[PDB]
Amino acid sequence: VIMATNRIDILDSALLRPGRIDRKIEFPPPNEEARLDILKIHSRKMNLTRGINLRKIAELMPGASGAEVKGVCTEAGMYALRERRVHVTQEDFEMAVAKVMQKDSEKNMSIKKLWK
Amino acid sequence: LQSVGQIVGEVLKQLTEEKFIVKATNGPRYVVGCRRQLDKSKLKPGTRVALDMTTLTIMRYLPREVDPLVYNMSHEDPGNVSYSEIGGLSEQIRELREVIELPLTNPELFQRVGIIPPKGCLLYGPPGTGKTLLARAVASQLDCNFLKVVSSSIVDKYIGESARLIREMFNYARDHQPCIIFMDEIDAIGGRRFSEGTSADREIQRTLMELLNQMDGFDTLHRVKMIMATNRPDTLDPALLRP
């Protein structure tokens, strides 16, 4: 039997008990080589251009989950679609990375400077 | 004596022009036909219907079942209170008369002006200042369906029942146009959204969201014109406070 969750820490101790659940496999966010592999998988069907360096795109994704990598592929494809083309260029991937990974930071600098 | 009585049920789907999926109440579902002379264009899904007990065909549609709480909240007589018996509210009562009455007396005036008739308004003030009486006077003067409600009376211990009661309230309102939803003490429902996380106030947030949806959500409101009174206008949720 296989079970999945994002919150293991809250699961019942009698359910996490070995013998009932052994090999508690962790799926950590992919590292740079893994992100590159996921990119090369999800851009397989895409019509890439000569001169695309997916390694740079993977480097542009610190701590980005695999789903975010697929989303970056999709958003680069959509950027290609918007201009009614079929090729995806490196700038398309850069802007897709910027769009997908965009997240709200701490706007207030003073709150951010509480810690040294 | 020659009558035989009929089953009741709700139409679930229109399989074709004739065959209807009908679920009898607390019983099995069937595929049934309809009587020869009937308004098939009226037999929408969810329409409570009557079934011949033997041949099981659509005999006559029925009005949608009303919740007992909604029934009780609907058939309370306003007492036909007149407009004279308010005293010293002249400007505000004129304003309320406009915003509720006028779309219900001359909608063509609003349409030719070029605006959408208003959805409703709030009456805030210290208790005992006549908001209930003023709304009652508007209802009596309109001679329309009146849904007198106090927001403290809809909250329930059961988790999803308060929002459900709001849904039944507005479903009755849409079924009984023209109707006036008077929800007193609205601060007991729309009392601002916060993420502290206590169960009771969180269900209050859910009920407030249901009310917002039912009043200015996806399904637009036509001729319902809802009145809301409270003593603490400031604590109302901004989304509810939004126009």
């Binding site: 820490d9 101790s13 009698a14 008990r17 070995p18 013998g19 009932r20 052994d22 090999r23 508690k24 962790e26 | -």
Partner: protein
């Protein structure tokens, strides 16, 4: 009443190294199995015995008709009519035919009724609805007290509660103390509660009825208490018997004022269970054993001293119990000589019996990872943290 149940085959494991001593023993077992098979086959090959009464039986069957619906004799009236409730729940005032054994009619016994014009036409003493039949152990679990490491006090207490009375109980009324009606096992998960239940069910001489606790709850109204009543009726009917209700906190939680019909029915099921536990005398040879992890969340009326006197605690295994468990679970392994096993036991952790078993299994897997089966110490070293997932350092030093 009839006798107990749960027949099991032979322990074997006198050797376990497949040194052909296992082979002679299993050969004797299989040969005798062949003997049983041949005997019963040849018996049914030549077994002419039928008819005899026939015509009297034929006409009593004709009176019975077909089908005959079973019902529960709720109440009896003057000895020609009675009150019987059909399995639907509707009950009727029916007549009792002459050929039924008036001694057998007793409130609760399943009575055969005529399909048309309901009438008591037979008595079934073995209704045993499929749920309670399933809840009965047929093939006893293979675990044994030799398989349990540590828990000497726990095994000792459980044997004093649910073995000593069934075997020679003369000490109990010699000392004037009643045998302990019911024992409850509690402790952290994976400490040996269910394992001890299996071990008891192995070296047993009474009907063992395994229950999930949550199994007792049923959807239809009145099915829950009826199931509990039938389960305990089977326990008394097959006395001596042991009723094991695992995970008693599935129903044993704090009683509170019920509002919903389902909560009311759960409370009713627990009330029926408690009343039934009170119903049979402690001198009676039916004992109940309940296990749970969250002991504190139990109803303090289920654990009343007048109801469940004993309370067996299952603490996390100590170092000596850890080494006994490791000896047990590494017994089958072909451990290399370099493994010490004492480093893992040393490591101050919350290793349970289940955790030790998983550590051993993971060590075997890691040995398989290196294509070997000799399982060195390094495999255990990595397996320990492979299984044990998840005080800020220098606070308490």
């Amino acid at each position: 009443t009839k006798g107990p149940d749960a027949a099991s085959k032979l322990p074997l494991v006198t050797p376990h190294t497949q040194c052909r001593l296992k082979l002679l023993k299993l050969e004797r077992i299989k040969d005798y199995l062949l003997m049983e098979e041949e005997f019963i086959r040849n018996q049914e090959q030549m077994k002419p015995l039928e008819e005899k009464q026939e015509e009297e039986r034929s006409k009593v069957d004709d009176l019975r008709g077909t089908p005959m619906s079973v019902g529960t004799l709720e109440e009896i009236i003057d000895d020609n009519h009675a009150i019987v409730s059909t399995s639907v729940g509707s009950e009727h005032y029916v007549s009792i035919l002459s050929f039924v054994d008036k001694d057998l009619l007793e409130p609760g016994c399943s009575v055969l009724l005529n399909h048309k014009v309901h009438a008591v036409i037979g008595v079934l003493m073995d209704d045993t609805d499929p749920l309670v039949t399933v809840m009965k152990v047929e093939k006893a679990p293979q675990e044994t007290y030799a398989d349990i490491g540590g828990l000497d006090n726990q095994i000792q207490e459980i044997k004093e509660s649910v073995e000593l009375p069934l075997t020679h109980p003369e000490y109990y009324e010699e000392m004037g103390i009643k045998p302990p009606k019911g024992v409850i096992l509690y402790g952290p998960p994976g400490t040996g509660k269910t394992l001890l239940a299996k071990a008891v069910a192995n070296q047993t001489s009474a009907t063992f009825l395994r229950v999930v606790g949550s199994e007792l709850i049923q959807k239809y109204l009145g099915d829950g208490p009826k199931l509990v009543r039938e389960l305990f009726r089977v326990a008394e009917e097959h006395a001596p018997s042991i009723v094991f209700i695992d995970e008693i906190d599935a129903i044993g939680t704090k009683r509170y004022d019920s509002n919903s019909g389902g909560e009311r029915e759960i409370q009713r099921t627990m009330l029926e269970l408690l009343n039934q536990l009170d119903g049979f005398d402690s001198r009676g040879d039916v004992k109940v054993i309940m296990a749970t992890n969250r002991i504190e969340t139990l109803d303090p009326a289920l654990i009343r001293p007048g109801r469940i006197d004993r309370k067996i605690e299952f603490p996390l295994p100590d170092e000596k119990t850890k080494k006994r468990i490791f000896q047990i679970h590494t017994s089958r392994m072909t451990l290399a000589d370099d493994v010490t096993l004492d480093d893992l036991i040393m490591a101050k952790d919350d290793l349970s019996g289940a955790d030790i078993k998983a550590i051993c299994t993971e060590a075997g897997l890691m040995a398989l990872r290196e294509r070997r089966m000799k399982v060195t110490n390094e495999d255990f070293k990595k397996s320990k943290e492979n299984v044990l997932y998840k005080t800020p350092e220098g606070l308490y030093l």
